[PDB]
Structure 1
Amino acid sequence: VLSYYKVDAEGKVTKLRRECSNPTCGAGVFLANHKDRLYCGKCHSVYKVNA
């Protein structure tokens, strides 16, 4: 259930609400809405930042 691929034009996928950096896997999806507690998907490099 996603309509969040408003992407940049011609043509590559560079994403607002920026992605993750980890060799463990692909890490080509967003890191989006957070509120006083974060959760960066996958198992890259934690990321205990503020919201």
Structure 2
Amino acid sequence: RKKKVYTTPKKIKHKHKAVKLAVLSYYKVDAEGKVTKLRRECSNPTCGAGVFLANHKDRLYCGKCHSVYKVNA
């Protein structure tokens, strides 16, 4: 062993850096002063109405779960 060749394409590629978007916590705001749910809550008893279900394409996906909460709609 003298050196390394790295015949694999030259990938020092790393993960997405927990992608830094702007401020995002927004239900919606009407005038004086009410707020209503968008990106609705989960059906989990252990998700006590505080989690947002992402809608990618015909999917509802929770992030409180490690992997999978699928209430599809």
TM superposition score category, shorter chain reference: 0.3 to 0.5
Cα pair distance change 1:40/1:10, threshold 3 Å: same
Alpha-carbon shift at residue 6 of structure 1 (Å)? 0.4
Cα pair distance change 1:10/1:50, threshold 3 Å: same
CA-to-aligned-CA distance 1:1-51 (integer Å, 9 cap, x gap):
215220578877641221102222424232133137653221399334657
Provide runs of 4+ in structure 1 moved above 6 Å: 8-12
Contact in 2 for aligned 1:22/1:44 (Cα 8 Å): no
**What is the RMSD computed on CA atoms of the aligned residues?**
3.9
Structure 1 gaps of 5+ residues are none
**How many residues are matched?**
51
| Equivalent-residue separation in structure 2 for 1:9 and 1:45 (angstroms) | 38
* Higher RCO (C-alpha under 8 Å, 6+ residues apart): 1
Structure 2 gaps of 5+ residues are 1-22
TM-score when scaled to structure 1? 0.42
